[PDB]
């Protein structure tokens, strides 16, 4: 069984060996970060089923991120397997703030009167919190008595109960038992902060991004198809057009505007925690599946992430209901599930990649019978799609070990992916960039190659490959999909099928 | 339009001029038949519609048969188009006998009592008649009082009153108004006349055909798979295993075997006319839509045949269920259409031919909408047949103008064709043997090319040969079919889309 | 087997015998009508399955009309069953005149030279055939050289070569050997006669009928809405609203206004003969199956007619392709098929009508797996059509022997033969007007009983009369539908599952 | 809205108030329960829509089971909401002891050796665990060094490292952070141990619970159908044959003997944390979404049950996967949702059942788009049945606010919920046993009434007791089942759509 439904893991302390010393131990941050220890563990992760690892802006600086970018270099040699590397914003959003005099937390028990300050660039007292809201916006007047302000992907509730104009703070009510810490997402539903469609921050983020060297970007909270254009140009402008965008819906308004997002983007990255918490969290299921849907008719890449396997970040085992939400997401036609705290922060980092790739090898087998998806509904638009219709018939008709593509920049693997069909897809590529380009695509085996000569025979490669892959043996049936001739052809035109020697 | 449903056109006097005097005319058979002009007639036909001609061996003698299959050679010389040449054979049948005196028929009126002879090598009287019965059985006791003895595809009946001993004569009441004519099938239902599996005139009526060179056999009165199977023989023994059988259902026991006789055959004739006799007539449309079913299901052909456009032996214009018909039968999923006494009898074999091309035309364009036949219920039991359904899926899948298969036995095509692929299919082959075999099969083009060359584009030779025969103009896509590269490919491997230039 | 496709049963002299003479026999018109004895001839067609005779008005003159409609009555009486009557009015239509002297009609062949006359109030002669134009229009100046003029149904082909000015007589040459009769309908392809809204002498012939008492009325050639809404005013006007109509579709004009026509009319009679001469042959079929849905979709009643079993007007078995059509206008969904020149001027009425209602009854069996018409796509648009949908839904579910309505005007029968359930209908109605309307409609078997009182039990009754009728036996399971209670409710409302003591 | 679909809520000392002190409380324990304070707060869970509350005598004693009981009737009085009684046994399960002391449990850290005792009869301390194995069966001979012995749904892993005879412990090393608390499942995959067929505990347990007076029994590990049929015969032997029994599936043996368990009992709890440790993790959503179809069509309830909202034990709201989890089960097409620890043993049971009722509102209205649950595919295998499919058929044609069936024992109601119509379904019975029995089928609101006499109108019944119950109001359509007439009826016979006055 080869895992079809492609894997994002959250990078974090929780592989990382600092001076010998492990995420927790007391003095960890204080020391130098082991880079050789610490890429054996992101090695075991990869072996495991991770495809793309993702580097969350929202919490390291620069020096953190691209230390730990590096690290994720030596650990695809040393996996002897290469990997996505996806940059994950802040986005138009607020976040928390530091304590007064060493204290971390306050024991917030539920129902005291306390407060928020709206002030910026300041720091927090346990009877007053500072909100670090990302540039520096004053929110004061947005927030009216009534709303909610929520710590934590909503694990702490405060009730705005009044508003004192003389400090600009909000007198809240704890609703219930929580901690508030730094760099933590808050959300204030149903309110109207205007945030600017790229903020300098993200700006920054992104650039640092582009210079270690990225395949994809997943844009925090993308409200219309302006916040993932206005990202599509600095990459362009960098001369770093291959690099692919998700956008993060995690909003009513980026809901609302689905059909430009999509168009404007490359993904869709189901952005759950936000999303639970901004939207009725009843009708995140419904958002999911249509989500899905509509992704997968655009020939787009669909990530389903948060709280997939929550649970692993203490314990050596996930609940019924995670493994359920793991196997539903594959089934209604994910290409990828992703990890949060359970591969960054967590205990069992490991554990956690290798349970998501068991459930999703099992959720795999049943996509025949209990599968969402309906290639037969599309309508196909080009001669690479009537090619990838074609492939998909061939692996309905009789049983397919492998379909194989030669392809300049993915897009036939892309098109093939899109029909998911029953085999795996071995994308033969010409470039390293378009190889970790079609990393997070459903069934793609990206593998770099030599570009073909016009005297080369591509169906000889093509089994060569797949032999030297390890994904066939003789006697098996193999699709092969081609333009030929090369420098000839325009497009994939050729559909062969094969029996390997 | 090019015209995906076949027509079979029997042959005879209607279209042959004799001694400048066509047939009718007092003194035509003492004349000798003008090949040329006869010839001019027939490529008028090919140039209809007619894809091949059946020469029925129930009428003619030897010399008659073999003078016209002659004609016919001339014909497509004239017409610059080849066809088919389809042999009928006598079969396991009764048919009738000559008058004493000059008389031709009596006044068969209604409710007298007459006779009918079952002494064989004999001739009738106005009382008497007789029955030429193929071979020279004696069906005396095989016939019971009560028993139907009809005249004339069931024209006239005559019902069993009583059994005289000492002649070996049936006594007979005239039921209805009608003609006794020679040669005319004489049907026995619900009696058990035990015929032989192979009787000499028609092994010598078959091993004359197939000195002439014949394409197909059309077997009359299949009643079981050893009926198919001794004609199997003669044509193996004779080195003409190209020759295709096409059993003819007409009875209960051929219904009874059907799935036996479809396996040891090439295709099935649905001979309504006796079938209509021999089993309630109310039955025959339930067995004509299952036998066009299961023949498709089989990859083999199948004919509709009989009163099709029965008026139009007299009149130009067919009946509304003449028409209703033959549109029926394409929307059935019939491979062929066939006319009998309309092109080799009648007074309008041209216009027949003819109006049978436009209906069959006009149908052709309903089958999207009301087609009977289903290729997504079928298995695909081989790589061949894999490669068919992707062609049916690639013309669904986007407008296709033509489906071009390089095929050396006609297998490919014939698999393509079981498809109903919405396009005309050009089969390309190298003998002339294949390329008359393909006529009948449904949307086959055949044409003759020169056997393709290790260094030869198979690709570019389908785009020149399709653009040669008219069927392609530039911007047209089409799906070409090939076993490549030619002396390594086992079978029909590759698929390619192309924009003709 | 109860036959749920009705039969329309053209009537005239060939049922009818005169002083002891059959039709076909020297002096039949000279002798005065056997009432009795032609009564008895047409009992035994209802006994056959004739559900309902037609009269055309195109033929003869309100004598033989009127007296021929007194002997069905006495038909029913001797029958013990009813039938409904059914007017078919000449409309904007040509017919050939009456001849000079005793000559009905006269044999034409190939290339003779006649005349035909525009002069209107004149009889033919054998070369100067007179026509009697609706409104008696001059269509001298409508009618150019090269039009063609055909005679009945088209079987008889007049090439117009020249017009003398002098007489207003159009120059014709024979096509085709053939007849022209009296009364028979003329036909002018390419022509825009300007027909008046409604004939004079169709106001006369419908208000002749409605008097006699007529259950429905064909209207030849509708046009257009305002052909049906003239004919429904004199309906309404005469106290006649209980009578249906049926619109003819016969010329292009109606099948461009197909939607509009159906919306005014009780239903449609597709008439082929003057169809497949006004439109291209070959779109017959295509226009048959394409009005047969539509009437249905509209709870509407559909009618077959022309050609159906041709053969059998002078022979005892109809051809293989006669037999098709019949089983497949069943197939297509028809409420009825009908007999014209076989029932009404043919040597085999009783027997056209027999093998009708075989081939009918047979075809009904295979409804099930290849009937075209899909209940399942109806909007219910009603609470009496959402009760049909659910007595459909019982017959399905399980062995129903048959479904027993109690309906005041037949509308829950309308829409439960609608949904083509599997059993039959039994439409137990409390007047004659209401039992005659519904012997067109699927599947519907129309009983006279009394109107049920608030204290009657409508379940009891339905068994009682489903028994008496002979319909159901101990053990088996009907549905009954009924407006319970009588005097509150509004509408068919209720559904009963019951098994026969 | 109305929530089709039921609640099954796990009762404990969380909504328990004891001596006005809350769960998690010093001195809770000591002080005695405030029986109306308790009643009070079940009245809510009533009141936010559970249908039914699940007592688990695994947990504590008879007398604390017994209170409970009194207090939920209690609170069924104050909320004027009548709910069901669901009995757990213990079955043939291993739990872990009481601990001697004060002590309810002890932390454990990973790498700690601690011994688990197989002598029956003692409590545990902290270094050496107790078991209570049912049958009181010595399992030291069953268990080899190298197993694995989980506590509490898998959360805390023990690894057998040696095995001391002198005693008969195991000594085991803590594999993961946890806790031991006293009564707690305990598993040890690959083993055998032989439990017996009913233990006597559990023929205590039950014939208290019954005593009581409980509407149902949810039997612990079901093997096979005897493990079904042991406690059926106690609930006839008893006169509670009313009991309706739910087998656990919780095990490979469970799943084997699914067909033969799901024929013995009246529904199926799908108990995802025993069946998670027992076979592997990733198959329990195959096997949910098999189990839900099979019940479904056998007529019968499924409860989905463990983990559904388990974040909600400690936080005011649910994770994404959480969420995900109750949504996917009632697409499935479950019956009912359950809550474990969320309602007996967490801060939130109140926010639990309210929480669970939101996404199963939501859930319902995606039912037609996305449910699993086809009843087309049904076969209608009685009258009664056949009903049930027409009143789905009338749903699906036209807008019904309510479907309401007269149902003596609730088998009507049990069919129209099978089929899973677009409409509540209003359960009118005539006593308590059958209304509480229908409490868990999915979507039925039973209601007690007077049995109907045979002068009764039975539909006016209906649509007062719909209106008086704020069902339904003027103007909106009901679809009304009963057997008529009372008396004379074998079974629900009639359907009726009535527009409510
Ligand atoms: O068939 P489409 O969808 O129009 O795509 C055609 C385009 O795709 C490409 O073939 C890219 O395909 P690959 O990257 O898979 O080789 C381009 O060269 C070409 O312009
Ligand atoms: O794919 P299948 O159905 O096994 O057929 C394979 C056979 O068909 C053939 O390719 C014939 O095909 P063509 O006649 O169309 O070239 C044989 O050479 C081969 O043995
Ligand atoms: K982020
Ligand atoms: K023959
Ligand atoms: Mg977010
Ligand atoms: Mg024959």
Same mark, same amino acid.
């Given at each position: 069984?080869?895992?079809?439904?492609?894997?994002?893991?959250?990078?974090?302390?929780?592989?990382?060996?600092?001076?010998?010393?492990?995420?927790?131990?007391?003095?960890?941050?204080?020391?130098?970060?082991?880079?050789?220890?610490?890429?054996?563990?992101?090695?075991?992760? *990869?072996?495991?089923? +991770?495809?793309?690892? &993702?580097? =969350?802006?929202?919490?390291?600086?620069?020096? %953190? !991120? $691209?230390?730990?970018?590096?690290?994720?270099?030596?650990?695809?040699?040393?996996?002897?397997?290469?990997?996505?590397?996806?940059?994950?914003?802040?986005?138009?959003?607020?976040?928390?703030?530091?304590?007064?005099?060493?204290?971390?937390?306050?024991?917030?028990?539920?129902?005291?009167?306390?407060?928020?300050?709206?002030?910026?660039?300041?720091?927090?007292?346990?009877?007053?919190?500072?909100?670090?809201?990302?540039?520096?916006?004053?929110?004061?007047?947005?927030?009216?008595?009534?709303?909610?302000?929520?710590?934590?992907?909503?694990?702490?509730?405060?009730?705005?109960?009044?508003?004192?104009?003389?400090?600009?703070?909000?007198?809240?009510?704890?609703?219930?038992?929580?901690?508030?810490?730094?760099?933590?997402?808050?959300?204030?539903?149903?309110?109207? *902060?205007?945030?600017? +469609?790229?903020?300098? &921050?993200? =700006?920054?983020?992104?650039?640092?991004?582009? %210079? !270690? $060297?990225?395949?994809?970007?997943?844009?925090?909270?993308?409200?219309?198809?302006?916040?993932?254009?206005?990202?599509?140009?600095?990459?362009?402008?960098?001369?770093?057009?291959?690099?692919?965008?998700?956008?993060?819906?995690?909003?009513?308004?980026?809901?609302?505007?689905?059909?430009?997002?999509?168009?404007?983007?490359?993904?869709?990255?189901?952005?759950?925690?936000?999303?639970?918490?901004?939207?009725?969290?009843?009708?995140?299921?419904?958002?999911?599946?249509?989500?899905?849907?509509?992704?997968?008719?655009?020939?787009?890449?669909?990530?389903?992430?948060?709280?997939?396997?929550?649970?692993?970040?203490?314990?050596?085992?996930?609940?019924?209901?995670?493994?359920?939400?793991?196997?539903?997401?594959?089934?209604?036609?994910?290409?990828?599930?992703?990890?949060?705290?359970?591969? +960054?922060?967590?205990?069992?980092?490991?554990?956690?990649?290798?349970?998501?790739?068991?459930?999703?090898?099992?959720?795999?087998?049943?996509?025949?019978?209990?599968?969402?998806?309906?290639?037969?509904?599309?309508?196909?638009?080009?001669?690479?799609?009537?090619?990838?219709?074609?492939?998909?018939?061939?692996?309905?008709?009789?049983?397919?070990?492998?379909?194989?593509?030669?392809?300049?920049?993915?897009?036939?693997?892309?098109?093939?992916?899109?029909?998911?069909?029953?085999?795996?897809?071995?994308?033969?590529?010409?470039?390293?960039?378009?190889?970790?380009?079609?990393?997070?695509?459903?069934?793609?085996?990206?593998?770099?190659?030599?570009?073909?000569?016009?005297?080369?025979?591509?169906?000889?490669?093509?089994?060569?490959?797949?032999?030297?892959?390890?994904?066939?043996?003789?006697?098996?049936?193999?699709?092969?999909?081609?333009?030929?001739?090369?420098?000839?052809?325009?497009?994939?035109?050729?559909?062969?099928?094969?029996?390997?020697?």
């Amino acid at each position: 069984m080869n895992k079809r439904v492609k894997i994002v893991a959250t990078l974090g302390p929780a592989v990382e060996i600092r001076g010998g010393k492990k995420f927790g131990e007391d003095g960890y941050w204080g020391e130098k970060l082991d880079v050789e220890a610490s890429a054996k563990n992101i090695a075991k992760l *990869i072996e495991a089923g +991770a495809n793309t690892f &993702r580097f =969350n802006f929202s919490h390291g600086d620069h020096q %953190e !991120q $691209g230390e730990r970018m590096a690290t994720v270099k030596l650990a695809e040699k040393i996996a002897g397997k290469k990997v996505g590397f996806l940059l994950d914003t802040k986005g138009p959003e607020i976040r928390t703030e530091l304590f007064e005099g060493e204290a971390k937390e306050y024991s917030y028990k539920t129902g005291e009167k306390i407060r928020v300050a709206t002030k910026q660039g300041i720091k927090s007292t346990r009877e007053v919190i500072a909100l670090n809201v990302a540039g520096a916006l004053d929110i004061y007047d947005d927030v009216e008595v009534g709303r909610q302000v929520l710590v934590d992907d909503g694990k702490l509730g405060l009730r705005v109960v009044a508003k004192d104009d003389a400090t600009r703070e909000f007198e809240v009510e704890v609703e219930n038992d929580g901690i508030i810490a730094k760099q933590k997402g808050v959300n204030i539903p149903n309110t109207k *902060i205007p945030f600017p +469609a790229l903020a300098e &921050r993200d =700006n920054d983020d992104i650039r640092f991004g582009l %210079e !270690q $060297g990225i395949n994809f970007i997943a844009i925090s909270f993308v409200r219309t198809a302006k916040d993932v254009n206005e990202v599509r140009a600095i990459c362009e402008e960098t001369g770093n057009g291959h690099v692919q965008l998700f956008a993060k819906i995690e909003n009513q308004q980026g809901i609302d505007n689905l059909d430009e997002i999509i168009e404007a983007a490359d993904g869709i990255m189901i952005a759950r925690g936000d999303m639970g918490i901004e939207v009725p969290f009843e009708m995140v299921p419904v958002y999911q599946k249509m989500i899905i849907k509509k992704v997968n008719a655009a020939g787009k890449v669909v990530i389903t992430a948060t709280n997939m396997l929550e649970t692993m970040t203490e314990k050596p085992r996930a609940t019924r209901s995670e493994v359920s939400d793991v196997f539903n997401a594959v089934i209604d036609g994910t290409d990828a599930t992703m990890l949060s705290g359970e591969s +960054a922060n967590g205990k069992y980092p490991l554990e956690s990649v290798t349970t998501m790739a068991t459930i999703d090898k099992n959720a795999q087998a049943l996509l025949n019978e209990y599968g969402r998806l309906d290639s037969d509904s599309f309508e196909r638009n080009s001669k690479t799609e009537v090619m990838a219709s074609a492939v998909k018939d061939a692996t309905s008709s009789m049983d397919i070990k492998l379909v194989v593509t030669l392809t300049k920049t993915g897009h036939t693997a892309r098109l093939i992916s899109k029909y998911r069909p029953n085999a795996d897809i071995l994308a033969l590529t010409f470039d390293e960039l378009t190889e970790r380009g079609l990393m997070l695509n459903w069934g793609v085996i990206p593998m770099l190659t030599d570009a073909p000569s016009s005297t080369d025979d591509m169906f000889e490669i093509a089994e060569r490959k797949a032999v030297e892959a390890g994904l066939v043996e003789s006697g098996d049936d193999i699709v092969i999909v081609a333009g030929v001739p090369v420098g000839e052809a325009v497009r994939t035109n050729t559909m062969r099928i094969r029996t390997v020697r």
